[PDB]
């Protein structure tokens, strides 16, 4: 009789425990996806941030050469 | 009061599980939005760096063409001197 009184509460509890476990795992799955994504994209950003820095350095290297070659093309006109 | 004492743990635990499940159901929605926001923001910053790279690559070739142009003249002017 006690078992018949308790059965609805034991069934509901089992339903809620199943759901609680599923949601804990779901959150963990999702936080791992977010964590995996963020670290991948942030790494690819660092790779592109290096390429930009190299291209910016190389562009200044050409600016210094253009100023050097323009001085030479001016010295050669003084000689002419 | 003995039936009440037998069911009180399930009544309490069930109420605790419902509260937690509701909070985690919101937690999942909040988390999927955060993941989508993070992904959009980082993928956008990647595109911003992609354009800068393309502009720097185009500008670098523009300097390569000028260096070849200036080197030709700096060679033609030496020939004129001789």
UniProtKB/Swiss-Prot annotation, chain A:
Site annotation Microtubule binding: residues: 39, 42, 46
Subcellular location: Cytoplasm, Cytoskeleton, Microtubule organizing center, Centrosome, Centriole
Recorded coiled-coil stretches: 13-80
Domain of life: Eukaryota
Family: Belongs to the CEP135/TSGA10 family.
Record note on domains: Coiled-coil domains are critical for microtubule binding via the formation of a two-stranded coiled-coil structure in homodimers.
Role played: Centrosomal microtubule-binding protein involved in centriole biogenesis. Acts as a scaffolding protein during early centriole biogenesis. Required for the targeting of centriole satellite proteins to centrosomes. Also required for centriole-centriole cohesion during interphase by acting as a platform protein for cep250 at the centriole.
Oligomeric form and interacting partners: Homodimer.
Name the UniProt record assigns to this protein: Centrosomal protein of 135 kDa
Lineage, top ranks: Eukaryota, Metazoa, Chordata, Craniata, Vertebrata
Gene that this sequence comes from: cep135
Residues of the full protein shown: 65 to 144 of 1164
